[PDB]
């Protein structure tokens, strides 16, 4: 519980500020899949297909929907990660006003183009498999029937690899980072224009209502704070059981759905057994066909339920993908004035990062630190005329009156060029007495 000492002639203004770094996790796409209706529903038998052919062409719409989902995931990934038409390259030097950037820039030393933070993120997340050329032949030896993917391939369920590889995604992220570090935000509206980092920082501070002289008189402090913050976030993201649960959830749900589907195959469904050969033997056709029909209907209904459940998640995945694309466009390529969207507190910029089946952001924010008591008044009446601040707040420590900006204490002296007059001073509420310098005289 906290209380605010609200008084109709009191105000508080910060002196320090503080830079901070926060992360954000967003899934972008799931794992594509395909099914083999004929061999799954009955098996290796031949009469199963003959009895099935008189049914409907159920596999057609299932294949159509699955192919639609598979292409839709590719469309989502391409839409979110292809917002630029050029592949920029970083300059050979790595000096930007004293800042540190080795933690996110690509490392040519590593054979695989993947920066340090991306390396940690990729190693932290554990997938079902790394490569995808692995098949039944790659299962030879004791590896056979020892992998979940291998058993799924045994049961006629195959996985189609995504069109875009990891290296292309890394190159896209590196190009975006280079464009947002060298050319500023202008490269999102045509041709990139080079500009020094300090002037871009001055622009961004001017965006949130702070004069550039604050930055150009404190550059070392912001540089050190930014470097310490990026080091701290690098150390902290490793941790254990971190916010990567959002990405882990998709894989867990897919694995649970596939496991339930495959294990559900061995149900008798109220028949004599769940073996096609066993039903084929020990029984004459007249009731064996009834049992086979019941089993086929049950298995087909279960497959349809699985298809519907799988189709369900595509809508939420697409919504998350559109949200991620929106965040990319309106946080990386510029500065968003909408509060609490591109981070917590006043927003400065962001640097994207790539993760398996998702994207990772690194917001950069700005927060005031230490405030002070002050006494304020709404207006000033010197020559029987009201005076108002051009922009800022009229303040005073107790003895003399000064005018200063909003989010940074910086007293000055009231002058004619810093104020504009309007009307008389007999209609405002809390006006006081003071004088104006009027430097012309």
């Amino acid at each position: 519980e906290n209380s605010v000492a609200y008084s109709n002639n009191s105000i508080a203004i910060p002196t320090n500020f503080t830079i901070s770094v926060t992360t954000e996790i967003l899934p972008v796409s799931m794992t594509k899949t395909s099914v083999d209706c004929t061999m799954y529903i009955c098996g290796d038998s031949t009469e199963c297909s003959n009895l099935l052919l008189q049914y409907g062409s159920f596999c057609t719409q299932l294949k159509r929907a699955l192919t639609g989902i598979a292409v839709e995931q590719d469309k989502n990934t391409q839409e979110v990660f292809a917002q630029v038409k050029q592949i920029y390259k970083t300059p050979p030097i790595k000096y930007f006003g004293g800042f540190n950037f080795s933690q996110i820039l690509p490392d040519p030393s590593k054979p695989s183009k993947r920066s340090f933070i991306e390396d940690l993120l990729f190693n932290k997340v554990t997938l079902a498999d790394a490569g995808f050329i692995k098949q039944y032949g790659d299962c030879l030896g004791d590896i056979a029937a020892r992998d979940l993917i291998c058993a799924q391939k045994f049961k006629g369920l195959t996985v189609l690899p995504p069109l875009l590889t990891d290296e292309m995604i890394a190159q896209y992220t590196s190009a975006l980072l280079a464009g947002t570090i060298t050319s500023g935000w202008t490269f999102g509206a045509g041709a990139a224009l080079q500009i020094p980092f300090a002037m871009q920082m001055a622009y961004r501070f001017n965006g949130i209502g702070v004069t550039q002289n604050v930055l150009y008189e404190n550059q070392k402090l912001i540089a050190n704070q930014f470097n310490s913050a990026i080091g701290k976030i690098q150390d902290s993201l490793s941790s254990t059981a971190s916010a990567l649960g959002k990405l882990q959830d998709v894989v867990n749900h897919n694995a649970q759905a596939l496991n339930t589907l495959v294990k559900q195959l061995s149900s008798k469904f109220g028949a004599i057994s769940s073996v096609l050969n066993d039903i084929f033997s020990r029984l004459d056709p007249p009731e064996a066909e009834v049992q086979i029909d019941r089993l086929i209907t049950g298995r087909l209904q279960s497959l349809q339920t699985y298809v519907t459940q799988q189709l369900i998640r595509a809508a939420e995945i697409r919504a998350s993908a559109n949200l991620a694309a929106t965040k990319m466009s309106e946080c990386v390529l510029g500065q968003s004035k909408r509060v609490d969207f591109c981070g917590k507190g006043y927003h400065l910029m962001s640097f994207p990062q790539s993760a398996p089946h998702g994207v990772v952001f690194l917001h950069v924010t700005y927060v005031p630190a230490q405030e002070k008591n002050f006494t304020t008044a709404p207006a000033i009446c010197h020559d029987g005329k009201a005076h108002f601040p051009r922009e800022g707040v009229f303040v005073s420590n107790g003895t003399h009156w000064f005018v200063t900006q909003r989010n940074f204490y910086e007293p000055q002296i009231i002058t004619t060029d810093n104020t504009f007059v309007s009307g008389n001073c007999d209609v405002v509420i809390g006006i006081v007495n003071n004088t104006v310098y009027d430097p012309l005289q």
């Binding site: 098949q135 030879l140 030896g141 058993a151 195959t158």
Partner: protein
Amino acid sequence: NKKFLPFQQFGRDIADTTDAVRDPQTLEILDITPCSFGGVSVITPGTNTSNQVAVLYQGVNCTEVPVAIHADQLTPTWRVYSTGSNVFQTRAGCLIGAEYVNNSYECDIPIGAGICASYQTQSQSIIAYTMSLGA
């Protein structure tokens, strides 16, 4: 190389599949892996433009597809595609009917693993190449 206990008859695994069996005559551990199976996809550049096509197989190293083609006993054009005219092996599978080059430009028909097939004009034939992100 996996070993069995003296009383074990035949093994299993996760998702209740018959993994390994021990031969009654010799008591030696043997393994089971089914025959190659997978989907088939056909790449075409449009019937108006041309009629030749390139076929594809998913998740299969195809050093043994001529056997499957002969067993299928289809028309001789299927056996022609079983010949080693131009066989290129990819991450998704192997491609038959189109040659491989390495000059990269904008994609036309997605295949997978950053490989696209287009119809270049130089004689006209189906060409396969690697994805290009730009300049």
